[PDB]
């Protein structure tokens, strides 16, 4: 009795203490169990998150009362060396809030369908027993199709069933495939590393039926075109642990503590090791708070600083007092000693292509791919074609290595850098200079569009009779930076204060960063790299990579790292961290996701070009290739709209296409048989005759636009969708908020490769299906929503760039309500498809185009120039001057069987990637015991894939990264090419086999593999390029070395052969609309930046209440105090932001850390929470991408040329967005458009 206890008042009094200031009571404390029982749970399950953040953190999912209640980090990762800090606990605030989703009011519980589409679907089925025909009855009617396409994003969802929606989906896909082609069906799902199997589910189903898989690394602009350019590698960087090995680090456009949260401690802790840290951001970002120095250059001007620093370095560590380490490094690992041919001009020369062994008389002995082997001079004047050049990768074996040997005599021959001191004469070469152009918001420095420098050269006798002049990349490089070498150059600098081509004083003007600051850091960075042998590092992120000239910004930073020999050195290098693109078990996952175990090849497409076209954003282009042309280029040779360059690249086999042909590809075989010729040659003939055209040339003819789109693991229409308003208008056919006119209405010049029509085709997409667990913005505008399972309700695998562990995703409980895993959703759809397609599609023959692939033999396509077979400049030879033309067999009725089984191709042909190929039979035998096998049917005897685990197990067994057995065969295959032994990089792990249930118990470290250049050892951390430098394995580039000089035609003519400052472009999306729809409040033009937010990962978590409460409670934009006060904007005021492309609404965050001239809306806050109606469009306010628009860069389209060849996510147009300008102004009328009556009005 608690009542009777009070009577023991005095009896419970113990001793006092502190001289009567305290009393020790002996009272009951049972009440304390209250919190104890709250903490107690049913069990903990291990799992991670399937979101794009590179975190890849293992979590403990706490289940209590049969419900997921909360979660904390797993701290059991395999510990790093004793001298490096360990990874635990990792995690971030976003991840810690995931649990909120499982039962939140925003959870998608049942498959949903738009009421209008359902009503017409159910009436159509009451008239057409067969579903394909019921679909046809609706889609082929204008008033019908229109009725549901304009309902998009306008409420009206009604509960459906898996049964009803699976039929409609399969029906829609059969119709679409049988009446237009398989390539008119596509799916967009990104970053597979975050859930290998969840991505693979759709990718597999689409590949099986011949649909197109859209890229993402270039679409998001996470792809640094500079990487392929310099190393011929998509992306390969050191792990976050390696940062602790560096003694000098510069975070450049990388808000590490906010965007690389789980790895930030490596950066804060390496400081205690004596490492100096420097933050380079225009605003006082979180990254600044943890550095010893903070530099704030003008946004976009970064390449300027990089150039100046490169200057100081080349001057003080390569010229004045040379560095033994630096010199040997560039000598052996760069293309600097390589010879460049000089072209003729008017009184001056111009850098041309690189000299190839084929140009010389004897051809240097190299008779195999001589036109593909570079040349240089040795220390004894003798000319030579050293090993390693891409010419040795194919058609021969044993010379594709970076050993400093003669390609012909196989002897130890040292190469020489500068010709200075042995040049016949001194030629004057012109280099382009754009530092003088730019908009009004950036400082400029007038010099001359062309700068003449005096280069030391040598005259050589070409094999074809004539003669020309040559000079090393090293020479042009020193000339390009403006280093006075004693020939008395007027354009060369005499002191660091001299304002010439790329000096500290020069950059101080462009960037605004004191010249002395630049000189200091450059000196320190380089000094450190010298003392430690490359242990200097630069962490760069979207801060630089999302500008139209991301290439220049990066090559800027890259040359610095190379001049100090930091690449391939533990503790140094190029650390590019953006999206979670390092799906480590690559070669074991590709066959699963793209069904390469059954058919070959699959339909890959680069999303940027895809949306640029079908979203019809090219119809509003403002940028012209002309204004990007080099001053030293023949303008008349590069005419046409940007999209015209894409179309040419597509037919020259450079970039992929989708839809490919303007004619159903399943019928080409049925017409080639009647014509008496085989399908391949019948296509080459029809393409020449123009009887069969590339679909790209006529995107609006009603048969060359996608009709069915699957979206999963993406919020395309609310996040990544650059040109949100254009997508809503053209792809969806719904109300949009575009503000400008198009080329037609303005009367601009129409493309010379694509049909023009005044009224663009709208509502192209017939069916949009989105799979998600929460009702996102994309879902809101879809036709059918499929409730997918959360990351805590399904099994899958996850890996990252930051660490070498491959942990899992597990189900703490079965999916809630009617939800299903992405894998079970596509399996069910593949099942319903296989029965609905009966009598419509059978065993078909399909013609598939395939662009010249990088890492393949065909990458040695056009070596010296650019020949367009359509302009008659040469013959149409598929695989060389046009895409390959493949014949794929498709057993449509056996889709479901193939989807649920590992195909025969793994045994017949083999498996491989990145150039090599190995036998993988033993792996299949093992897989037959693990997954069991099919009893009968078309896949009888083949290993099974009924569940996600079966799939995960396939990935782990075939991948060399998770199976030491395969890892040895993989290093063996590459040893053939190199001629050096590499098996010793995996031998002592040969008996290692990672199992799904093994990693469920504890995350496991992977095995060193040729697919990557860093190592998985216990003595050295994973550093990108370490193998190239320490194993003498060549970079998949033309010269086999790190490319500093890009000699491809298009590169030379677009002034990108050597790095040069290129100011931020003008999109001209503000001047044509500012002031038009005035509301009475001052408007102003500001640079619109969108770094990634702190309260979400893209748009995920952006609707999550914990994140919304820790943030500002919805969409907001940051403005400087001046900009704000000048527009009469107080903190948290409703403001409007807009331009040609559209308008968005948000509340303002006024802050001192935002430099005047810019505004920031942290990336992804989407369109579903706390958004009022716009005064500019009279519609729901739009999103941050409502004011951006895609604008491609030509140099990002170069294909069929060694390291510049296509590859899914390897190369291709990127969707940059930081150059954008918007108009900001305070709002007046805050109308919510809900009919609630709760509207406000802001005064003044």
């Amino acid at each position: 009795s608690k009542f009777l206890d009070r009577f023991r008042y005095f009896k419970q009094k113990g001793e006092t203490f502190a001289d009567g200031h305290g009393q020790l009571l002996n009272t009951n404390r049972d009440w304390e169990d209250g919190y104890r029982q709250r903490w107690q749970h049913d069990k903990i399950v291990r799992s991670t998150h399937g979101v794009n953040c590179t975190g890849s953190c293992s979590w403990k999912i706490y289940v209590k009362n049969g419900l997921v209640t909360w979660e904390t980090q797993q701290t059991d990762y395999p510990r790093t060396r004793p001298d490096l800090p360990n990874h635990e606990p990792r995690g971030c605030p976003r991840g810690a809030s995931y649990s909120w989703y499982l039962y939140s009011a925003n959870r998608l519980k049942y498959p949903m369908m738009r009421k209008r589409l359902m009503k017409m679907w159910r009436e159509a089925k009451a008239l057409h027993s067969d579903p394909v025909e019921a679909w046809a009855s609706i889609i082929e009617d204008a008033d019908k199709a229109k009725s549901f396409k304009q309902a998009r994003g306008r409420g009206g969802f009604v509960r459906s069933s898996w049964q009803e929606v699976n039929e409609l989906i399969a029906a829609s896909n059969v119709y679409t495939i049988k009446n237009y082609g398989p390539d008119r069906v596509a799916g967009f799902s990104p970053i597979p590393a975050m859930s290998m199997v969840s991505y693979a589910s759709g990718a597999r189903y689409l590949s099986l039926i011949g649909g197109t898989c859209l890229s993402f690394y270039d679409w998001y602009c996470d792809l640094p075109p500079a990487s392929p350019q310099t190393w011929g590698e998509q992306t390969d960087v050191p792990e976050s642990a390696d940062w602790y090995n560096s003694s000098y680090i510069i975070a450049w456009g990388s808000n590490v503590p906010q965007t690389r949260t789980p790895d930030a401690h490596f950066f804060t802790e390496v400081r205690y090791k004596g490492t100096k840290t420097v933050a380079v951001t225009p605003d006082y970002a979180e990254i600044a708070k943890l550095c010893d120095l903070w530099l704030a250059p003008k946004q976009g001007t970064d390449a300027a600083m990089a150039l100046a620093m490169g200057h100081v370095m080349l001057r003080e560590f390569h010229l004045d007092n040379p560095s033994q380490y630096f010199t040997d490094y560039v000598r052996r690992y760069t293309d600097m000693p390589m010879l460049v041919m000089l072209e003729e001009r008017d009184g001056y020369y111009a850098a041309g292509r690189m000299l190839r062994a084929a140009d010389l008389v004897d051809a240097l002995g190299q008779e195999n791919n001589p036109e593909w082997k570079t040349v240089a001079f040795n220390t004894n004047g003798e000319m030579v074609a050293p090993n390693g050049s891409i010419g040795f990768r194919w058609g021969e074996k044993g010379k594709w290595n970076l050993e400093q040997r003669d390609g012909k005599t196989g002897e130890e021959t040292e190469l020489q850098l500068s010709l200075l001191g042995s040049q016949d004469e001194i030629a004057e070469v012109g280099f382009p200079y754009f530092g003088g152009d730019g908009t009004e918001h950036f400082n400029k420095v007038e010099l001359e569009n062309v700068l003449l420098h005096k280069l030391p050269v040598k005259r050589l006798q070409l094999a074809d009779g004539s003669t020309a002049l040559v000079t090393t990349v090293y020479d042009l490089t020193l000339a390009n930076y403006g280093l006075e070498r004693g020939l008395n150059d007027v354009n060369c600098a005499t002191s660091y204060d001299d304002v010439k081509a790329y000096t500290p004083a020069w950059a101080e003007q462009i960037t605004g960063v004191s010249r002395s600051q630049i000189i200091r850091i450059a000196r320190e960075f380089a000094d450190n790299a010298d003392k430690t042998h490359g242990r200097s590092m630069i962490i760069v992120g979207a801060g630089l990579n999302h500008w139209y000239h991301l290439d220049m910004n990066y090559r800027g930073l890259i040359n610095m790292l190379i001049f100090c020999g930091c690449v391939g050195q533990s503790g140094g290098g190029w650390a590019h961290y953006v999206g979670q693109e390092k799906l480590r078990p690559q070669t074991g996952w590709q066959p699963l996701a793209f069904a390469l175990d059954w058919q070959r090849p699959a339909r890959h497409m680069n999303s940027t070009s895809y949306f640029y076209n079908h979203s019809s954003q090219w119809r509003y282009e403002t940028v012209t290739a002309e204004e990007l042309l080099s001053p030293m280029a023949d303008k008349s040779r590069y005419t046409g709209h940007l999209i015209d360059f894409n179309v040419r690249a597509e037919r020259m086999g450079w970039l992929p296409s989708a839809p490919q042909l303007g004619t159903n590809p399943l019928t080409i075989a049925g017409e080639a048989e009647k014509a008496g010729m085989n399908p391949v040659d019948y296509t080459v003939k029809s393409l020449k005759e123009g009887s069969i055209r590339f679909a790209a040339e006529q995107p609006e003819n009603g048969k060359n636009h996608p009709r069915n789109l699957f979206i999963w693991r993406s919020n395309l229409l609310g996040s990544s969708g650059k040109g949100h308003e254009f997508m809503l208008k053209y792809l969806l056919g719904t109300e949009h908020g575009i503000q400008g006119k198009d080329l037609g209405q303005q009367g601009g010049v129409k493309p010379e490769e694509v049909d023009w029509q005044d009224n663009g085709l709208e509502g192209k997409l017939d069916l949009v299906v989105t799979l998600d667990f929460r009702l996102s913005s994309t879902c809101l505008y879809s036709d059918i929503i499929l409730p997918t399972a959360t990351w805590y309700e399904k099994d899958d695998m996850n890996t990252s760039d930051m660490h070498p562990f491959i942990h899992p995703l597990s189900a703490a409980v079965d999916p809630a309500w009617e939800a299903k895993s992405d894998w079970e959703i596509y399996k069910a759809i593949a099942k319903k498809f296989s029965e609905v397609c009966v009598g419509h599609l059978g065993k078909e023959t399909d013609i598939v185009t395939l662009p010249i692939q990088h890492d393949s033999a065909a990458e040695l396509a056009q070596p010296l120039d650019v020949k367009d077979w359509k302009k008659g400049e040469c013959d149409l030879i598929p695989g060389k001057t046009a895409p390959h033309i493949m014949v794929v067999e498709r057993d449509y009725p056996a889709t479901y069987e193939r989807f649920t089984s590992i195909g025969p191709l793994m045994e017949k042909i083999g498996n491989g990637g990145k150039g090599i190929a190995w036998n993988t039979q033993s792996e299949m035998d093992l897989l037959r015991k693990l997954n069991y096998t099919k009893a009968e049917g078309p896949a009888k005897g083949q290993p099974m894939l009924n569940t996600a685990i079966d799939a995960a197990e396939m990935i782990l067994t075939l991948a060399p990264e998770t199976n030491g057995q395969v890892a040895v065969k993989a290093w063996a295959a590459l040893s053939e090419f190199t001629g050096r032994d590499h098996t010793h990089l995996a031998l002592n792990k040969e008996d290692e086999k990672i199992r799904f249930r093994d990693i469920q118990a504890q995350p496991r470290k992977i095995i060193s593999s040729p697919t990557w250049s860093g190592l998985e050892d216990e003595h050295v951390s994973y550093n990108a390029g370490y193998t190239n430098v320490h194993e003498l394995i060549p970079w998949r580039t033309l010269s086999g070395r790190q490319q500093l000089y890009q000699d491809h035609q298009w590169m030379r003519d677009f002034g990108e052969s050597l790095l040069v400052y290129r100011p931020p472009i003008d999109t001209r999306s503000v001047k044509e609309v500012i002031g038009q729809k005035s509301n009475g409040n001052q408007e102003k033009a500001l640079n619109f930046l969108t770094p990634h937010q702190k309260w979400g990962i893209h748009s995920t978590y952006s609707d999550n209440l914990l994140m919304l409460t820790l943030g500002r409670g919805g969409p907001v934009v940051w403005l400087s105090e001046a900009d704000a006060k000048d527009l009469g904007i107080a903190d948290n005021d409703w403001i409007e932001v807009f331009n040609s492309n559209g308008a968005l609404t948000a509340r303002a965050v006024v802050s001192q850390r935002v430099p005047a001239g810019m505004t920031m809306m942290y990336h992804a806050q989407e369109r579903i929470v706390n958004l009022p109606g716009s005064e500019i469009t009279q519609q729901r306010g739009g999103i941050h991408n409502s004011v951006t628009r895609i604008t491609p860069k030509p140099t990002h389209m170069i294909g069929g040329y060694a390291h510049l060849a296509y590859g899914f996510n390897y190369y291709g147009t990127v969707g940059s967005n930081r150059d954008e300008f918007v108009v900001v102004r305070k709002m007046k009328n805050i109308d919510w458009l809900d009919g609630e009556g709760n509207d406000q009005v802001q005064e003044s």
Binding site: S1, K2, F3, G14, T16, F17, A18, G20, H21, G22, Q23, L24, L25, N26, T27, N28, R29, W31
Partner: protein, 217 residues
Amino acid sequence: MQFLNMFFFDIYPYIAGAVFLIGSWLRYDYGQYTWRAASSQMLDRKGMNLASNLFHIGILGIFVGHFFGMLTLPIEVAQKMAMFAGGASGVLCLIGGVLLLKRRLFSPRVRATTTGADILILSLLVIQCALGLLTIPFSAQHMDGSEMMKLVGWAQSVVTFHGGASQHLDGVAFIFRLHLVLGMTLFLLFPFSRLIHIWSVPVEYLTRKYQLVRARH
């Protein structure tokens, strides 16, 4: 009227009195978590300082008076005090009460987070206070203390268990009947409301050592 007389004044006071004790005892033993004053100040500070202090300081005046007045200087004197002393406390309590009731009913946050037991009890008190102030002009007619003698006589019979207490009342004005009825009803509803905070008045704090530490247990 005779049936309803012996009921309300010879029986009802023992029902409410039993329910009051055993009710408190049971909620104290099985309802610790529900035993609190239930502050609402944080949700709406406006006008609370004045209102609550008026209400409490007044209601307390009345309690001391009622307590020592009917459970313990001649009669006519005491009556003059009750009317002037207690009459003033009543005006304060009534005002604070009314202010608190206006708040609880029309102040968005307080009304959205309230329970019915809180509106009920507050309302009755305000009424019992108004009903009380109305007895003043009635006691006036008998400045000699004739009326007060009857009432105090009734009260003291009940608390000592001497039957026939409703007899002491013979004569008293009706208004007094009401006050005595509604009043006791509050003792009935006491244990099932917030009024339990009263039992907890923090007197022991005036002599407590500042720091408290609890041993293992």
